[PDB]
Amino acid sequence: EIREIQAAAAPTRFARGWHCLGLLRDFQDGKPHSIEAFGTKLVVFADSKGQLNVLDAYCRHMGGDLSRGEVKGDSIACPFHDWRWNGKGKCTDIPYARRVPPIAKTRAWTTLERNGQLYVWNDPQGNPPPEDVTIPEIAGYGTDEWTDWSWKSLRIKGSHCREIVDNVVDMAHFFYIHYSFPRYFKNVFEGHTATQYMHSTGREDVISYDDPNAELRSEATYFGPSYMIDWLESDANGQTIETILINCHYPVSNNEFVLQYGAIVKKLPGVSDEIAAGMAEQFAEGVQLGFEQDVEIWKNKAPIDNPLLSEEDGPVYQLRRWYQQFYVDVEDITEDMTKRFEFEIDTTRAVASWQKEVAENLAKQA
Amino acid sequence: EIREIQAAAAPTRFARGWHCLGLLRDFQDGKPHSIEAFGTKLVVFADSKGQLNVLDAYCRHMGGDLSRGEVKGDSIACPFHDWRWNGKGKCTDIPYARRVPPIAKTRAWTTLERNGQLYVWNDPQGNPPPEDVTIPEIAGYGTDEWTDWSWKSLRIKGSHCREIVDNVVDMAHFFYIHYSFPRYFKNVFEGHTATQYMHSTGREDVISYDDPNAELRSEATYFGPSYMIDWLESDANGQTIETILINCHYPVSNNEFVLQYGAIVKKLPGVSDEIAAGMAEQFAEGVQLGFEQDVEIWKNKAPIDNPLLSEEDGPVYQLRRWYQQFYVDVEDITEDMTKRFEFEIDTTRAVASWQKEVAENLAKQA
Amino acid sequence: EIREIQAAAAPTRFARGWHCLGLLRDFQDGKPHSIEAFGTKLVVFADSKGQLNVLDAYCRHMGGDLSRGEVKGDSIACPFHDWRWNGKGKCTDIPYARRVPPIAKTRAWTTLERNGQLYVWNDPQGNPPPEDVTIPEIAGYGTDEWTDWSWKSLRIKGSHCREIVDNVVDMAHFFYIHYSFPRYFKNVFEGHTATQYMHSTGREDVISYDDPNAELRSEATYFGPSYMIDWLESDANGQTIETILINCHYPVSNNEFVLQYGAIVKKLPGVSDEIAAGMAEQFAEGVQLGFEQDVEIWKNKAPIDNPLLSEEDGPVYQLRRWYQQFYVDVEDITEDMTKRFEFEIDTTRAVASWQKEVAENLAKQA
Ligand SMILES: CCC(=O)NCCSC(=O)[C@@H](C)[C@H]1CC[C@H]2[C@@H]3CCC4=CC(=O)C=C[C@]4(C)[C@H]3CC[C@]12C
Ligand SMILES: CCC(=O)NCCSC(=O)[C@@H](C)[C@H]1CC[C@H]2[C@@H]3CCC4=CC(=O)C=C[C@]4(C)[C@H]3CC[C@]12C
Ligand SMILES: CCC(=O)NCCSC(=O)[C@@H](C)[C@H]1CC[C@H]2[C@@H]3CCC4=CC(=O)C=C[C@]4(C)[C@H]3CC[C@]12C
Ligand code: FES
Ligand code: FES
Ligand code: FES
Ligand SMILES: [Fe+2]
Ligand SMILES: [Fe+2]
Ligand SMILES: [Fe+2]
């Protein structure tokens, strides 16, 4: 009878799509920057104009680390013998030799500079990104109406990055882990994008303040495989506090990945830049604690390809079907991966059950 | 000519039998307790009545760690979504869903609660323990006549647990490592149990006190593969000081194992509970130093399936033949494993040789 | 077009030849000494006379670590059961048993005691060293005219020891890494020995003093695969300061190796033993910083069997052809490995290019 767990070996291959490697301001200071990603090391530097360039970190001459080098003009100087390489990956200048060989070309990585952020496009097939596959421009970033990012990062070891994407369908953990109250849950999976819609409230059995029915309306969408944006809103004190929360990650290796996230808020009327920036901080700091709680779950949990779902669980398999799209060749993608699938959880019993617990635990004091 | 060493790969498989995972008082406090054993993780919790239950640590729903959970009633609540699992391994209650699937069953581990201790039965074939395979009840544990355990543990990395069992036939190390004087040595190997009989004394070249011929009579028996009990006695100050020393271990993985041991003493007449407990402590503290010295031997030694024995060495091969019984299927056990084999070392020359050294080293001072 | 890197798996096999395991004074104190080398552990002890002996560290009886033992007479006493083994590897005496088996023989390692140093000969084929394969005696070590070694060591992890030998042909790194000025460079590769000849000067853009054209004449030769000696000379203050710098290494495993080096100076006329020894120290301390800078290069670099060389690069492939000699059977060596190959780099443009940089960087201050 006993149901056993199925742990298939984690994928050696890495996902095809845009992966966010952090803010432009962090890469716009002239220096190069090493990054261990996709089972190797990349170097990211910024030419005189400002354009950020990305190549393989290992120099083709003697294997030197180009990220330990120095930027000179619009080329990267290797710390070993100061060979110069440009954005496109062609050796421009050898300082002690007359001229360079034409076959001196290294792999340049296709980049996109948007939303105050840097994206790289990994694709083991090696082809450039299509037209319809990209990253949305956020309503109005850059202008004074929205604050700058309260951006933060964690480095996770000992597990695969599949199970951060699994959170898209896990309504129940928001209660028992993050200490919120889901009242609504719907998911939509279109070709290469995966969505979560959620209306959630706080729970009364917590110490300081929020309204008795302080409610938040979330709307999160992976523009897959690794990059999510979340539009958030709560109508309190008359007007609505809009917030945009970014969740994005990238793999280092199959066993390890980096996790990035940040938040900006629209400037409410009658509020300064600092008060606005403080709201963004508090929100990100609150998410910080959230993902810290996930990490302890993720760190101690075992991988499992055969879940046993109840009737209140979201569509795990259809999420992991859609997510399989990115680890396979584009030519081998099937309809069942990119199809339109939608599903809403009947939370009526779930919330009724959670009301018993929240009230029961209030009576215990004082 | 040169004799070479034979290091065959350590067994992936784990031994079949009762393994002691420590004292009942350490698991009787309501909380769950994680334990990494047998190439995986188990969770051990105690229901309301007191009965200790053991299952696989990884939850069948989403792989959550049940040892990071909480006990509610007579079920274990998963820290991920608070699913409830009972002693037998059936899901009893999902708090946010109406009812549970009948196919929600996880692997329960067969347990035995005895001698103030908890044993689990691992057996890769998956069958329950027979009738004649078990653990002896100690003469009279529980009553006031015997003290509670001075119980202690070490965690050993970088070697297999075979070579703690090898100590059963190694008379010579007691001298050069543990600093005792063996006068007698006999071994008996019956079906699934392995015995050592030893009469040993102290050596005069040690600093403080013991009698000039202070003698100890040991009688140790593995009720194999992992669990040993040792009856000890010394007749001093008129009456006999009886002691019972437990040696027991369990594997974490092929490359790592935990080592547990403890001692109780019979209350001598005219002696309080505290003085009695102090004798148990001193003895265990003296063994502590002993096994610490073994660890340095075990840590720096290499594994070796082809020893080169002298004429004063105990039966290594016949010990490792008997010990092979537990890593093979019960159906593939042969007579040579379970046979009656007995052997006594003629120590006459050995002790004569050690008398030269002990006396020689007294003359060096002062 | 893009040129890709070729990282073939590092050799499991270890090089055939003399490897220097350090100074005789460090092994001449009676105690044994463990050493992890050649994918295993060796023990090195010194008999009563003084002769250093080397065997496998793991005792053939029960695998005990002989390096954790004690020397008694001209035999090594095992810390487990004090079995005694002599220089040739025969068990001499079991202290608690009457006599020893004749088949008790362990592997002794062929040694050479010279230049205040100890060499071992590894050779996976197991044959002794020929006549013409050895280590030169240094002009006049031992006498008062030359000081004792300022000897030093580093332990390098995460890379193969091939690429310290690669430095033999890398003129360019001396400039950009070590901050010197190469004016001359020639290499010679005879059967089993590899040579570098270099005339180098300091560069004027450095803070404190040296002459405006303070020049050094280097002459380094690997008596391969692992052992190099370097004769150095600079004619300053009328007479010539001769120096002899040793570079030598040995592998621990394919992924890790130890790096040793030291320097002695000829006593100039009118100079004491201490002033002389201080010159040796300063030189070794200056090399220290040098190899420390290499380690950061070696630590961050990737292995690469397909370099892309310019017209000012030394003969990498012909160095690695000659170096392949030692990882193959002696019977499978070809002419192209042991042939006479010589090559000199036309440095005229290289030095002209480096003069622009050194002068340009002087103008920047103050
Ligand atoms: C108390 C005020 C405060 O500072 N609160 C902290 C921000 S609210 C919070 O951290 C949690 C209750 C929830 C609320 C929104 C949740 C995110 C929804 C989008 C999302 C979809 C996923 O699939 C996975 C994660 C997120 C990013 C959710 C994380 C938890 C959040 C922020
Ligand atoms: C000085 C008074 C004192 O506190 N002595 C410490 C206890 S005596 C001691 O540690 C050692 C000298 C010896 C004496 C009995 C030995 C055990 C016999 C049973 C045994 C069989 C084995 O195969 C392996 C280990 C043991 C548990 C022996 C360990 C060493 C002991 C305790
Ligand atoms: C400033 C005075 C002083 O203390 N100088 C430090 C000694 S000079 C030094 O460290 C470097 C500039 C150079 C000079 C000689 C170079 C060695 C030549 C032989 C050699 C051949 C190789 O293939 C690899 C390394 C060496 C040992 C060279 C290391 C760098 C040296 C010492
Ligand atoms: S390693 Fe990049 S310059 Fe040679
Ligand atoms: S992981 Fe145990 S409740 Fe889902
Ligand atoms: S291990 Fe060397 S004496 Fe037994
Ligand atoms: Fe979460
Ligand atoms: Fe022992
Ligand atoms: Fe160097």
Short mmCIF file of C-alpha atoms in Angstrom, two decimals, chain A residues 11-147:
data_model
loop_
_atom_site.label_atom_id
_atom_site.label_comp_id
_atom_site.label_asym_id
_atom_site.label_seq_id
_atom_site.Cartn_x
_atom_site.Cartn_y
_atom_site.Cartn_z
CA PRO A 11 18.36 18.36 -14.83
CA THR A 12 21.93 18.93 -16.04
CA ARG A 13 20.51 21.28 -18.67
CA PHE A 14 19.60 24.88 -17.81
CA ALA A 15 16.38 26.69 -18.68
CA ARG A 16 15.95 28.72 -21.89
CA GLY A 17 14.93 32.34 -21.33
CA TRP A 18 15.79 35.69 -19.77
CA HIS A 19 17.43 35.48 -16.34
CA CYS A 20 17.82 38.62 -14.24
CA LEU A 21 21.35 39.17 -12.92
CA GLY A 22 20.52 42.33 -10.91
CA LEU A 23 20.41 46.11 -11.12
CA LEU A 24 22.13 48.30 -13.71
CA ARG A 25 23.43 50.64 -10.99
CA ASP A 26 25.33 47.68 -9.48
CA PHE A 27 27.05 46.99 -12.84
CA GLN A 28 27.52 50.66 -13.85
CA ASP A 29 30.74 51.59 -12.03
CA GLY A 30 33.47 50.83 -14.62
CA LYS A 31 34.83 47.73 -12.86
CA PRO A 32 34.12 44.22 -14.18
CA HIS A 33 32.00 41.75 -12.14
CA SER A 34 32.29 37.96 -11.92
CA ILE A 35 29.16 35.80 -11.83
CA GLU A 36 28.94 32.03 -11.44
CA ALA A 37 25.92 30.93 -13.46
CA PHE A 38 24.75 28.11 -15.75
CA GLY A 39 27.44 25.63 -14.69
CA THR A 40 30.25 28.06 -15.50
CA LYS A 41 31.53 31.61 -14.87
CA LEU A 42 30.55 34.75 -16.78
CA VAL A 43 32.04 38.25 -16.63
CA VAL A 44 29.94 41.40 -16.94
CA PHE A 45 31.52 44.78 -17.72
CA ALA A 46 30.33 48.22 -18.90
CA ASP A 47 31.90 50.08 -21.82
CA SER A 48 32.55 53.85 -21.82
CA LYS A 49 29.11 54.70 -23.25
CA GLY A 50 27.29 52.65 -20.60
CA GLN A 51 26.25 49.52 -22.48
CA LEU A 52 26.77 46.43 -20.30
CA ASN A 53 28.52 43.53 -22.06
CA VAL A 54 28.66 39.86 -21.07
CA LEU A 55 31.03 37.07 -22.17
CA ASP A 56 32.56 33.84 -20.86
CA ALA A 57 34.80 34.66 -17.88
CA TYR A 58 37.60 32.35 -19.03
CA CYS A 59 40.09 33.89 -21.48
CA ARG A 60 40.72 31.85 -24.64
CA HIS A 61 44.49 32.52 -24.54
CA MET A 62 45.50 30.84 -21.25
CA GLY A 63 42.19 30.46 -19.37
CA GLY A 64 42.69 33.61 -17.28
CA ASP A 65 39.73 35.02 -15.38
CA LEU A 66 38.52 38.11 -17.25
CA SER A 67 36.40 39.15 -14.25
CA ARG A 68 39.65 39.55 -12.27
CA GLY A 69 40.80 41.94 -15.03
CA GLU A 70 40.32 45.66 -15.72
CA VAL A 71 38.25 47.64 -18.23
CA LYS A 72 40.26 49.78 -20.65
CA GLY A 73 38.23 51.87 -23.09
CA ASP A 74 35.46 49.63 -24.41
CA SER A 75 37.43 46.38 -23.95
CA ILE A 76 38.16 43.99 -21.05
CA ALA A 77 41.85 43.62 -20.11
CA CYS A 78 42.79 40.11 -18.93
CA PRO A 79 44.67 40.06 -15.61
CA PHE A 80 47.14 37.48 -16.97
CA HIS A 81 48.62 39.19 -20.07
CA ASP A 82 46.29 42.22 -20.59
CA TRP A 83 44.75 40.96 -23.85
CA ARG A 84 41.82 43.22 -24.83
CA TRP A 85 38.35 41.87 -25.78
CA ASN A 86 35.36 43.96 -26.93
CA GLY A 87 31.60 43.64 -26.36
CA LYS A 88 31.09 41.36 -29.37
CA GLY A 89 33.88 39.06 -28.13
CA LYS A 90 36.62 39.88 -30.66
CA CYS A 91 40.16 40.45 -29.41
CA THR A 92 40.88 44.11 -30.19
CA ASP A 93 44.45 44.63 -28.97
CA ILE A 94 47.39 42.63 -27.59
CA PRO A 95 49.52 45.29 -25.87
CA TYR A 96 52.95 43.63 -26.39
CA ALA A 97 52.27 42.16 -29.88
CA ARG A 98 51.83 44.04 -33.17
CA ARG A 99 48.44 42.69 -34.30
CA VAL A 100 45.82 40.10 -33.28
CA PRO A 101 44.66 36.87 -34.98
CA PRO A 102 41.21 37.06 -36.65
CA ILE A 103 40.23 33.69 -35.10
CA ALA A 104 40.42 35.27 -31.62
CA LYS A 105 36.68 35.33 -30.91
CA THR A 106 35.00 34.41 -27.61
CA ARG A 107 31.31 33.82 -26.86
CA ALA A 108 29.31 37.00 -26.26
CA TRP A 109 26.00 36.66 -24.41
CA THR A 110 22.81 38.31 -25.64
CA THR A 111 21.69 41.00 -23.17
CA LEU A 112 18.72 43.29 -22.46
CA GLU A 113 18.82 46.49 -20.40
CA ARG A 114 15.40 47.35 -18.92
CA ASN A 115 13.46 48.24 -15.74
CA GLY A 116 16.66 49.38 -13.99
CA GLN A 117 17.88 45.79 -14.42
CA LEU A 118 20.13 43.47 -16.49
CA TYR A 119 18.89 40.29 -18.15
CA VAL A 120 20.95 37.63 -19.90
CA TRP A 121 19.55 35.09 -22.35
CA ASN A 122 20.84 31.52 -21.87
CA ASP A 123 19.82 28.98 -24.52
CA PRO A 124 21.88 25.78 -24.90
CA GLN A 125 20.83 25.59 -28.58
CA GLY A 126 22.66 28.91 -29.00
CA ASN A 127 20.05 30.80 -31.03
CA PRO A 128 19.03 34.39 -30.28
CA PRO A 129 15.73 35.30 -28.56
CA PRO A 130 12.58 35.51 -30.75
CA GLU A 131 10.36 38.60 -31.06
CA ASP A 132 7.47 37.64 -28.73
CA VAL A 133 9.79 36.32 -25.96
CA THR A 134 10.98 39.19 -23.75
CA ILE A 135 10.37 41.10 -20.50
CA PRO A 136 7.58 43.67 -20.01
CA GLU A 137 8.40 47.32 -19.37
CA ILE A 138 6.96 48.30 -15.98
CA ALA A 139 4.16 50.89 -16.30
CA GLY A 140 6.35 53.91 -15.45
CA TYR A 141 9.73 53.15 -13.92
CA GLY A 142 12.32 55.96 -14.04
CA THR A 143 9.99 58.89 -13.39
CA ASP A 144 9.51 60.44 -9.92
CA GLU A 145 6.05 58.89 -9.43
CA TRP A 146 7.68 55.54 -8.51
CA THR A 147 10.56 54.98 -6.07
#
